[PDB]
RNA sequence: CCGACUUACCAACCCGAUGCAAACUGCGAAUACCGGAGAAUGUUAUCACGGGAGACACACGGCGGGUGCUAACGUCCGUC
RNA sequence: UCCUCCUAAAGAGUAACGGAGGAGCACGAAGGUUGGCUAAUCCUGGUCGGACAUCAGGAGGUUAGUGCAAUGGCAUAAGCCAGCUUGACUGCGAGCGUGACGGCGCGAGCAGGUGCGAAAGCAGGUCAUAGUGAUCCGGUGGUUCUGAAUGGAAGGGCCAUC
């Protein structure tokens, strides 16, 4: 499951998720799944969607995961009050903005690529759309 | 110096005809000769560094510069500023005199001497060679040596490449293998 | 720390003195310096003494 | 259930803010001795009629107007005073 | 001794392409702030000194944020 | 209690049992000045010598160094080396910065007397920012002050310091 092998700091501010994505274009495969909504992808969600599409293509072709979950999310345990310092790190997320290409694929028919991405999108919280590599 | 005149009157002119250099200034020249003893055991007994320094003095005829550790290395238990070796750099007349002694009397005394390796060049016409034991130099009295110790010779030249550097040395009958 | 206070007393007949800190262990020999003495208005030798 | 004790933070320290930065801006008239910049290191350099203190404070050595300028090969920022 | 083949694997540096950063910057606004000149408007709206205070439990709403679960009619800051 | 960074919204300031690290010193040289010098790392060739010691050359160009955290600085170097020294001086100080205040900080220039330099000049500690504690009380030295009738003295003041 995706995590940075090491990080300079352990905990991070919440921040905000304004703006539109860089990486709007298919760059390695011929087909891809593009984010249309906005939100967080957790490492678990990314992995679940990955497993879904590879099963659909029976491991044929190649798959690129374009997003990486590098942001640590903390939570406090149950029955604890406010204060007493920042909670412990629980899981890692990637911040998604509209337009980001999440996955790419090639080496399979388009009519199979659509089916594979349909199965994967069902695992992701954000809405997504199928896109193809343009000339230029 | 004797070999210096041999350079001026023969080596330079034959090299000119060999490589077809356009200017006499283009012909390679010997710039310096440097002797190094990496004593090392000066980490134990400083008299060893002194005794090694006396040997370079006798061989070279000038007081050696003792060389300090560039940086600490735990792999050898050396701290920075510890004496590790000593060097002598020879230039001008005393360079040619040593160079003459080395060829004419010193290297003949090497055990099982078959000639020096012709490939011991750094890639830019500087030749470097080790000697295993000090006794090749008659200035060291065999009856009085404390310990075996070798040294490195390095010859620095204005040559641009090993082919030019090798030609320069061979012109002195520098005994390549 | 081992850095300990001392005073330097004017070698002139004046009472004037400076105070300073000295590492007693590593430098056991007495500190001695020329310094201005404003009572005689001259540079004069000063010598270490007990605070 | 039982109310459960929290832990403790290991952080919790900071130093007093030092009020660094530019104290007189371009075109501003100053008297001799006036401090122009409080710095850490020479983020600005002393130009004409400007001094540099032991803590790299730049100060006016003449009356005039403050001029900021970029000079030299390193494109370093110099402060100077122009006589009025 | 030196060492050859091969890989069900991993593979730094360098090179080409693609992303992320409160504690990264070879870039870099809008605003805000400091100084100067000018017109109009404003019951001197400014500053100094002196007499009398009260207050030092704040609340919500917008915008920028830390904490929390981008939970709270939660909590702690900035500005209106 | 003190220092450095973020939070902190491109002037200053800005809270939380918010996120991260340090100090409670060292140095008569690690200070002053004059003269000189320039790093890490890696690749080649060399006695013992090895992944790593000293030596020569090349690439590289500050990725090193800074007495100790972090930030900002530093080639004119503030980094490294050597000679001579005690300015780690005494009395002051135009004018500013920062604090509610007590306070803290920067500083050209005057007077005296010094050190380095041929000289111009530089020096009132250390690349800067932490290394600290009011008043009372008491001790030590000095002094052109005071001295309970008078001459002293005690005690007090003033100056240096504990
Ligand atoms: K009033
Ligand atoms: K800030
Ligand atoms: K010196
Ligand atoms: Mg109950
Ligand atoms: Mg601060
Ligand atoms: Mg109150
Ligand atoms: Mg209340
Ligand atoms: Mg209150
Ligand atoms: Mg409030
Ligand atoms: Mg509330
Ligand atoms: Mg909030
Ligand atoms: Mg600010
Ligand atoms: Mg602002
Ligand atoms: Mg110099
Ligand atoms: Mg730095
Ligand atoms: Mg320092
Ligand atoms: Mg009396």
From Swiss-Prot, chain A:
The modification N-methylmethionine is found at residue 1. HAMAP family: Ribosomal_uL16. One of its GO terms (molecular function) is rRNA binding. GO terms for biological process: cytoplasmic translation; ribosomal large subunit assembly. Part of the 50S ribosomal subunit. Cross-links to the A and P site tRNAs. Interacts with assembly factor DarP(YjgA). This is Large ribosomal subunit protein uL16. It comes from the Bacteria. Keywords: Hydroxylation, Methylation, Ribonucleoprotein, Ribosomal protein, RNA-binding, rRNA-binding, tRNA-binding. Pfam families: Ribosomal_L16. The modification (3R)-3-hydroxyarginine is found at residue 81.
Curated annotation (Swiss-Prot), chain B:
Keywords: Acetylation, Ribonucleoprotein, Ribosomal protein, RNA-binding, rRNA-binding, tRNA-binding. One of its GO terms (molecular function) is 5S rRNA binding. InterPro entries: Ribosomal_uL5, Ribosomal_uL5_bac-type, Ribosomal_uL5_C, Ribosomal_uL5_CS, Ribosomal_uL5_dom_sf, Ribosomal_uL5_N. The keyword Ribosomal protein applies. Part of the 50S ribosomal subunit; part of the 5S rRNA/L5/L18/L25 subcomplex. Contacts the 5S rRNA; cross-links to the P site tRNA. Forms a bridge to the 30S subunit in the 70S ribosome, contacting protein S13 and S19. Identified as a multicopy suppressor of the slow growth phenotype of an rsgA (yjeQ) deletion mutant. This is Large ribosomal subunit protein uL5. It comes from Escherichia coli (strain K12). The gene is rplE.
From Swiss-Prot, chain C:
One of its GO terms (cellular component) is cytoplasm. One of its GO terms (biological process) is response to antibiotic. The keyword Magnesium does not apply. GO terms for molecular function: structural constituent of ribosome; tRNA binding. SUPFAM superfamilies: Zn-binding ribosomal proteins. InterPro entries: Ribosomal_bL33 (IPR001705), Ribosomal_bL33_CS (IPR018264), Ribosomal_bL33_sf (IPR038584), Ribosomal_zn-bd (IPR011332). HAMAP family: Ribosomal_bL33. This is Large ribosomal subunit protein bL33. It comes from Escherichia coli (strain K12). The gene is rpmG.
Curated annotation (Swiss-Prot), chain D:
Coiled coil: none annotated. It comes from the Bacteria. Keywords: Ribonucleoprotein, Ribosomal protein, RNA-binding, rRNA-binding, tRNA-binding. Gene3D superfamilies: 2.40.50.100. One of its GO terms (cellular component) is cytosolic large ribosomal subunit. PANTHER family: LARGE RIBOSOMAL SUBUNIT PROTEIN BL27M, RIBOSOMAL PROTEIN L27. Part of the 50S ribosomal subunit. Cross-links to the 23S rRNA. Cross-links to the A and P site tRNAs. This is Large ribosomal subunit protein bL27. It comes from Escherichia coli (strain K12).
């Amino acid at each position: 499951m995706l995590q940075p092998k090491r990080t300079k700091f352990r905990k991070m501010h919440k921040g905000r998720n304004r703006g539109l994505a860089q990486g709007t274009d298919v760059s390695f495969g011929s087909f891809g799944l593009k984010a249309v909504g906005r939100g967080r992808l957790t490492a678990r969600q990314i992995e679940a969607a990955r497993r879904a599409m590879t099963r659909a293509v029976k491991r044929q072709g190649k798959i690129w995961i374009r997003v990486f979950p590098d942001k640590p999310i903390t939570e406090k345990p149950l029955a604890v009050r406010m204060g007493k310092g920042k909670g412990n790190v629980e899981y890692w997320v990637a911040l998604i903005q509209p337009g980001k290409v999440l996955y790419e694929m090639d080496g399979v028919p388009e009519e199979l690529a659509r089916e594979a991405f349909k199965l994967a999108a069902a695992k992701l919280p954000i809405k997504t759309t199928f896109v193809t590599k343009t000339v230029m | 110096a004797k070999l210096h005149d041999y350079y001026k009157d023969e080596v330079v002119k034959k090299l000119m005809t060999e490589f077809n250099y356009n200017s006499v200034m283009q012909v390679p020249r010997v710039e310096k000769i440097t002797l190094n003893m990496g004593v090392g055991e000066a980490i134990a007994d400083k008299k060893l560094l002194d005794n090694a320094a006396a040997d370079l003095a006798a061989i070279s005829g000038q007081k050696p510069l003792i060389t300090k550790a560039r940086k600490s290395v735990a792999g050898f238990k050396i701290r920075q500023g510890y004496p590790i070796g000593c060097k002598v750099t020879l230039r001008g007349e005393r360079m040619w005199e040593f160079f003459e002694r080395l060829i004419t009397i010193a290297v003949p005394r090497i055990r099982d001497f078959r000639g020096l390796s012709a490939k011991s060049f750094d890639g830019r016409g500087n030749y470097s060679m080790g000697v295993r034991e000090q006794i090749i130099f008659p200035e060291i009295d065999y009856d009085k040596v404390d310990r075996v110790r070798g040294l490195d010779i390095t010859i620095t030249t204005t040559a641009k490449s090993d082919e030019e550097g090798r030609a320069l040395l061979a012109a002195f009958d520098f005994p390549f293998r | 720390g081992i850095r300990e206070k001392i005073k330097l007393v004017s070698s002139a007949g004046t009472g004037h003195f400076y105070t300073t800190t000295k590492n007693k262990r590593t430098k056991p020999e007495k500190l001695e310096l020329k310094k201005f003495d404003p009572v005689v208005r001259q540079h004069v030798i000063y010598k270490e003494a007990k605070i | 259930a039982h109310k459960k004790a929290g832990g403790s933070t290991r952080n919790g320290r900071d130093s007093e803010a030092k009020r660094l930065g530019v104290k007189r801006f371009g075109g501003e008239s100053v008297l001799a001795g006036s401090i122009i910049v409080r710095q850490r290191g020479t983020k600005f350099h002393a130009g004409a009629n400007v001094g540099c203190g032991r803590d790299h404070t730049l100060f006016a050595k003449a009356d005039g107007k403050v001029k900021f300028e970029v000079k030299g090969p390193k494109n370093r920022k110099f402060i100077s005073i122009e006589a009025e």
